[PDB]
């Protein structure tokens, strides 16, 4: 019978999706391909390169700042930004804070069409006296690109960062058997999706399926 598409979504991070019944081994034919896409194709944001004025290397320590360069560049990977339109291919976030204050992601100076939905994200703790100024680059891409693959050089002395593009964290799918009066050899596909918040599990799934569809069509003209 038609695939009952049931949905159980809490927040914008978790989203369970069940879909049965299905023919023999179709759950697997759908899930896996959806997965590979949900983690490789989905477009989003990730900090590309950072630059702290007084800092040179990747492994160091800024006085007045408990956090180590590495711990900080890490914290930034966690940052989730959301662009509003195509005109914003690469946006450089700027932020400077001194003295005895906690540096949160909301302390970055607001940008025109960019939004920071990762406010309270802890970036650094600046002690009594503590100059922390830097410029973190942000881009729109797909998948995961190692800081050694793209190597962005805004500031000749800056440091590249691993690109965390997919707004989707992990994907899990299960193919359990289900009953339908006559035959019991049936597939039931439930795929669970985890998102950082930029987009929801349900939107992502749809975008995925679309992307697959768009590709299926490319089989149109022979030669």
């Amino acid at each position: 019978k038609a695939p009952v598409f049931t949905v159980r979504t809490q927040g914008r991070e978790y989203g369970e999706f069940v879909l049965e019944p299905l023919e023999r081994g179709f759950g697997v034919t759908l899930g896996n391909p959806l997965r590979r896409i949900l983690l490789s194709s989905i477009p989003g944001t990730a900090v590309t390169s950072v630059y702290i004025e007084d800092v040179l290397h990747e492994f160091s320590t800024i006085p007045g700042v408990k956090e180590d360069v590495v711990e900080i560049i890490l914290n930034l990977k966690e940052l989730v930004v959301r662009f509003l339109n195509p005109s914003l291919q690469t946006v450089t976030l700027l932020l400077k804070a001194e003295g005895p204050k906690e540096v949160k992601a909301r302390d970055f100076l607001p940008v025109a069409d960019v939004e920071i939905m990762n406010p309270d994200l802890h970036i650094a703790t600046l002690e009594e006296g503590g100059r922390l100024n830097m410029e973190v680059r942000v881009d729109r891409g797909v998948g995961y690109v190692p800081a050694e693959k793209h190597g962005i050089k805004d500031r000749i002395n800056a440091i590249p960062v691993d690109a965390v593009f997919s707004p989707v964290r992990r994907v899990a799918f299960q193919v359990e058997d289900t009953r339908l009066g006559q035959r019991t050899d049936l597939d039931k596909l439930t795929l669970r999706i985890w998102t950082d918040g930029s987009v929801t599990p349900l939107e992502a799934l749809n975008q995925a399926v679309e992307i697959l569809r768009e590709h299926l069509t490319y089989f149109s003209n022979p030669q």
Binding site: L39, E78, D162, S166, R169, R170, W194
Partner: protein, 122 residues
């Protein structure tokens, strides 16, 4: 399980910074492996540093790191030097039983899981 390869030479990053750079470019070469006997951290940990726990696994899923590779990962309160696999295991257990804290309170991600290490976990 964690992998160990070939130590083409000098394993001293335990102190030199030209040892982080050089040993890291020597790695980019064919000289120092992603899992070299280099005390504090084999170039394998210098290259990849993963913030969130998820961060680690995706890199895996994209082919950057094999599960059995020694990398560095930021967990709840510590910068831990453990492989993706180990970490993945942590999650599985922490998922089985919702009390994540009580999870890592009873597992040892310091050795490959043997029938006994699991026996005792049960």
């Amino acid at each position: 399980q964690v992998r160990k390869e070939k130590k083409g030479a000098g394993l001293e990053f335990a102190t030199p910074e030209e040892a982080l750079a050089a040993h890291e470019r020597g790695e980019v070469a064919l000289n120092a492996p992603i899992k070299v006997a280099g005390r504090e951290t084999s170039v394998g940990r210098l290259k990849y540093v993963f913030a969130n726990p998820d961060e680690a696994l995706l890199a895996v899923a994209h082919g950057i790191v094999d599960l059995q590779d020694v990398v560095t990962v930021r967990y709840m309160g510590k910068r831990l030097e453990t492989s993706p696999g180990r970490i993945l295991f942590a999650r599985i257990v922490a998922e089985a039983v919702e009390d994540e804290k009580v999870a890592w309170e009873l597992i040892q991600l310091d050795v490959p899981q043997e029938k006994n290490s699991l026996k005792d976990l049960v």
